[PDB]
């Protein structure tokens, strides 16, 4: 694991609060040890000799001592809570910051519910780090002073206490591995249940439309039964651990009283001294038993931290990248696919020996039937995925030798589905560019024909868009995406079926807009309708991951090939 080393890093700045906690703990333990002698003073001196005034005076003094140690415990609890909140905040921030940067094949291969559950199985790390748990660990460490004093008082009774301690330590090891496995098994089942719940909430309209509420109930019921079986198996290990710990504690107390009474009879002690030993055992055995009782909480936190570190061990997208050529400053130039092969993991290949050469500052089209792999080409250009064979070149430089930030800032991608995040229209338009002038946003919205309906909104570029832009129409969200892409001022523009829901008036406006750009930006159009690609320089027809033919519209029509058949059938 790396979490123990990472834990020490968090406490490095706080080298002054830890000292205060240590000193407060020392004072608290010393005051408790001092106050443990009250029963000895009662039974050896005050009760035997009937000293009422001394009874009152020493009782008040010990009450004052107890109040002092309570005030000390209040002081260190605040510092411990502050440290716990700081550590938990750092852990959560690091995990989210890392999970944002992971490669794209991580999100494809993982259900949303799994990631959500892994993130939200982190409140369990707060519980084992909160004010009371760290206080109990500190008391367990401080129990050394109590043990030393107990040895100073009696030897045989200290050895009995030591045997009790060893029996505590033996039980912990036996229940260490079984409790982790039981806590890990329930976490996976909880992740599966959360994934099922998320998936059922997603397709609730389809569930209702088909009357599939009962089947979903049965499936989630089976998952709940699995979770409850895991929890029950994990919940009976706690019963065995608690029963063994209670046996040890109670029998050790009875044995200590037995041996102390034997010593008192033999004359090696007195009743007051034995009672003081029993009272001082609260600072040698009680903290240890409290730690053993908290052990399941620590095991749950450790399992959750290990599950988080499983994600944190994955290398991010920038860590899998070869060195970047600093001479490349712009992505303007010819785009070439050189024998590109790609398959989504280990399945059948999607692209087989792909060969394009898109001239710089030219508008080209990639067309084909659904599933041919046009969006896969667009995502390879965006460098979401890497070709298994061949390479993609921009102006003679491999796309793997260009910095990822430059690639993702100089290439604009408009997808089939538009993602609208919770915020105003202004915030959605300025995504990743929250320092742009307002006039530029107006210019982009006008260029994408999005200004007209935005100015008709109640807030006029401040309208809080709900989740997934429900209040926005299907063709209104596409115009927002196109405006967001144009606001980027890119060097390569990819329109992946961005005009499917737009009307003729709007599509003509956007067509002139992307036609009116400088003769240095490359516009790549991925379209399913052939009526929107007639006036572009070159058209590549993709048929199951292969450029079977290419050329302008006139040349493709004057070939009587697959493109001519597509044009005749689709028109």
Ligand X SMILES: Nc1ncnc2c1ncn2[C@@H]1O[C@H](COP(=O)(O)OP(=O)(O)O)[C@@H](O)[C@H]1O
Ligand Y SMILES: CCCCCCCC/C=C/CCCCCCCC(=O)O[C@@H](COC(=O)CCCCCCCCCCCCCCC)COP(=O)([O-])OCC[N+](C)(C)C
| 252 counts as binding ligand Y under rule CB under 6 A | yes
For 150, residues 6+ apart whose C-beta sits below 8 A from its C-beta are: 157, 158, 161, 277, 280, 281, 284
| 375 counts as binding Mg ion under rule CB under 5 A | yes
Determine the size of the site formed for ligand Y (CB under 6 A): 15
Please tell me the distance from the alpha carbon of residue 30 to that of residue 234, in angstroms, as a whole number. 39
**Cβ proximity to ligand A1ACX, 232 vs 262, nearer residue:** 262
Question: Site mask, a second copy, residues 484-523, x = CB under 8 A?
Answer: x---x-----------xxxxxx------------------
Which residues of 245-293 form beta strands (DSSP E)? none
**Cβ proximity to ligand A1ACX, 292 vs 358, nearer residue:** 292
Of 128-136, 238-246, 469-477, 547-555: span binding ligand X (CB under 6 A): 469-477
Please tell me the distance from the alpha carbon of residue 426 to that of residue 464, in angstroms, as a whole number. 9
3-state secondary structure at position 223: helix
Question: Site mask, ligand Y, residues 51-70, x = CB under 6 A?
Answer: ----------------x---
Length of the chain: 571
Measuring CA to CA, which residue among 259, 269, 252 is closest to residue 157? 259
**Cβ proximity to ligand A1ACX, 288 vs 378, nearer residue:** 288
| 259 counts as binding ligand Y under rule CB under 6 A | yes
| 260 counts as binding ligand Y under rule CB under 6 A | no
Q: Which does 127 bind (CB under 5 to 8 A by kind): ligand X, ligand Y, ligand A1ACX, none?
A: none
Please state the closest distance from residue 523 (CB atom) to Mg ion, in A: 17
Name which of residues 429 to 448 contact ligand X (CB under 6 A).
none
Please state the closest distance from residue 246 (CB atom) to ligand A1ACX, in A: 11
Q: Which does 164 bind (CB under 5 to 8 A by kind): Mg ion, a second copy, ligand A1ACX, none?
A: ligand A1ACX
Please tell me the distance from the alpha carbon of residue 196 to that of residue 220, in angstroms, as a whole number. 7
Q: Name which position in 71, 74, 232, 344 contacts ligand X (CB under 6 A).
A: 344
Sheet containing strand 335-342, strands side by side:
351-358, 335-342, 389-394, 397-398
263 has binding-site annotation: no
**Cβ proximity to ligand A1ACX, 248 vs 274, nearer residue:** 248
Q: Is the dihedral of CA 552, 555, 558, 564 positive or negative?
A: negative
Tell me how many helices (H) and strands (E) the chain has.
24, 12
User: Phi/psi class of residue 339: alpha, beta or left (left: φ > 0; alpha: ψ in -120 to 50)?
Assistant: left
Q: Where are the alpha helices (DSSP H) in 211-268?
A: 213-266
**Cβ proximity to ligand X, 281 vs 340, nearer residue:** 340
Please tell me the distance from the alpha carbon of residue 382 to that of residue 241, in angstroms, as a whole number. 55
140 and 289 Cβ atoms separated by less than 8 Å: no
164 and 47 Cβ atoms separated by less than 8 Å: no
86 has binding-site annotation: no
185 has binding-site annotation: no
Report the residue closest to ligand X, judged by CB: 375
**Which tokens in the block code for residue 225?**
């039964």
Of 181-189, 209-217, 243-251, 294-302: span binding ligand Y (CB under 6 A): 243-251
**Cβ proximity to a second copy, 1 vs 243, nearer residue:** 243
Please state the closest distance from residue 553 (CB atom) to ligand X, in A: 20
Please tell me the distance from the alpha carbon of residue 474 to that of residue 509, in angstroms, as a whole number. 18
Q: Which does 374 bind (CB under 5 to 8 A by kind): ligand Y, a second copy, ligand X, none?
A: ligand X
Of 94-102, 121-129, 252-260, 432-440: span binding ligand A1ACX (CB under 6 A): 252-260
475 has binding-site annotation: yes
347 and 404 Cβ atoms separated by less than 8 Å: no
- Summarize as ranges the residues that interact with ligand Y (CB under 6 A): 67, 156, 159-160, 163-164, 167, 247-248, 251-252, 255, 258-259, 262
């Amino acid at each position: 694991q790396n979490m123990m080393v990472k834990f020490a890093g968090f406490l490095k700045p706080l080298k002054k609060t830890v000292l205060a906690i240590f000193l407060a703990s020392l004072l608290y333990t010393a005051l408790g040890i001092a106050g443990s002698f009250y029963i000895k003073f009662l039974f050896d001196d005050l009760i035997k000799f009937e000293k009422l005034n001394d009874l009152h005076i020493i009782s008040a003094g010990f009450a004052v001592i107890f109040l002092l140690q309570i005030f000390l415990n209040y002081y260190r609890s605040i510092l411990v809570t502050k440290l716990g909140m700081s550590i938990d905040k750092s852990i959560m921030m690091e995990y989210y910051s890392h999970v944002l940067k992971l490669p794209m094949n991580f999100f494809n291969s993982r259900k949303v519910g799994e990631i959500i559950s892994r993130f939200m199985d982190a409140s369990k790390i707060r519980q084992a780090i909160s004010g009371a748990t760290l206080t109990i660990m500190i008391d367990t460490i401080m129990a050394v002073i109590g043990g030393i004093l107990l040895y100073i008082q009696n030897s045989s009774l200290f050895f009995i206490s030591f045997i009790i301690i060893l029996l505590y330590g033996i039980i912990v090891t036996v229940f260490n591995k079984p409790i982790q496995n039981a806590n890990r098994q329930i976490m996976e089942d909880n992740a599966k249940l959360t994934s099922a719940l998320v998936e059922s909430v997603k397709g609730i309209e389809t569930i209702k439309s088909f009357g599939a509420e009962e089947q979903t109930e049965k499936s989630t019921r089976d998952k709940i039964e699995t979770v409850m079986k895991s929890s029950f198996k994990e919940g009976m290990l706690y019963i065995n651990l608690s029963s063994l710990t209670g046996i040890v504690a109670g029998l050790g107390g009875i044995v200590i009283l037995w041996a102390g009474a034997y010593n008192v009879i033999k004359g090696n002690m007195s009743g007051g001294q034995l009672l003081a030993f029993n009272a001082l055992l609260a600072y040698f055995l009680t903290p240890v038993k409290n730690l053993i009782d908290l052990q399941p909480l620590i095991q749950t936190a450790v399992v959750a931290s290990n599950r988080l570190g499983e994600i944190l061990e994955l290398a991010t997208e920038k860590e899998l990248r070869e060195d970047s050529d600093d001479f490349v400053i712009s992505l303007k130039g010819d785009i070439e696919f050189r024998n590109v092969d790609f398959r989504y993991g280990l399945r059948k290949p999607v692209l087989k020996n792909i060969n394009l050469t898109i001239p710089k500052g030219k508008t080209v089209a990639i067309v084909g039937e659904s599933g041919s792999g046009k969006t896969t080409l667009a995502k390879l250009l965006m460098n979401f995925y890497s070709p298994e064979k061949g390479d993609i070149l921009i102006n003679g430089h491999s796309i793997k030798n260009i910095s990822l930030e430059l690639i993702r800032k100089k290439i604009a991608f408009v997808s089939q589905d538009v993602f609208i995040f919770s915020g105003t229209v202004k915030e959605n338009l300025a995504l990743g560019n929250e320092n742009v002038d307002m006039d530029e946003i107006i210019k982009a919205a006008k260029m994408a024909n999005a200004h007209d309906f935005i100015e008709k909104l109640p807030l006029k570029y401040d309208t809080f868009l709900n989740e997934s832009g429900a209040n926005l129409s299907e063709g209104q969200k596409q115009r927002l995406a196109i405006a967001r892409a144009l606001l980027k001022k890119p060097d390569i523009l990819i329109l992946d079926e961005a005009t499917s829901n737009l009307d003729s008036i709007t599509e003509n406006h956007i067509k002139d807009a992307i036609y009116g750009l400088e003769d240095d930006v490359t516009v790549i159009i991925i379209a399913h309708r052939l009526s929107t690609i007639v006036n572009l320089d070159k058209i590549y027809l993709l048929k199951d991951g292969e450029i079977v033919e290419s050329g302008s519209h006139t040349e493709l029509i004057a070939l009587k090939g697959a493109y001519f058949k597509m044009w005749k059938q689709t028109e």
